[PDB]
Amino acid sequence: MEMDIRFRGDDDEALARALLKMVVRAVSFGAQVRFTDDGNDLEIRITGVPEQVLKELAKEAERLAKEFGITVTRTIRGSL
Amino acid sequence: MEMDIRFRGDDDEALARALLKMVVRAVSFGAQVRFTDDGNDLEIRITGVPEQVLKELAKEAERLAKEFGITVTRTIRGSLEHH
DSSP states (O other), X not given: OEEXXXXXXSOHHHHHHHHHXXXXXXXXXXXXXXXXXXXXXXXXXXXXXXXXXXXXHHHHHHHHHHHHTOEEEEXXXXXX | OEEEXXXXXXXXXXXXXXXXXXXXXXXXXXXXXXXXXXXXXXXXEEESSOHHHHHXXXXXXXXXXXXHTOEEEEEEESOOOOO
């Protein structure tokens, strides 16, 4: 299982602050973090932790989007 | 072959902006970019692009460091020796 987090906003500084907090939080849980492109949006790919930890990181992404005033979409990939 | 970029500074908002700019630039080249973190040591690992591209990304790291007033260091691993 992989979770992809795509932040979107109309302030790049806010996007930057959210991205940094999200990735630091993800790795603190032992997840692997990689970056790819989703059109012209940067996507954070989170892997290597159990499904329930991925779900908590999803909730974290929502909280960060609210904190910094941006939006977020989540994609869960590879479930059986 | 791999290029690792480490960011240090006092203003976390500046570090965040430099990180985002660096990642966006590397991804645009079709590079693989992985994020790692040691207490205060923000680092990205860049693979999957030619040596010259890695070299150009290293110079972009140079420019970001000056632009945002942070310290950026670089490590090359798994590279070949050239003339």
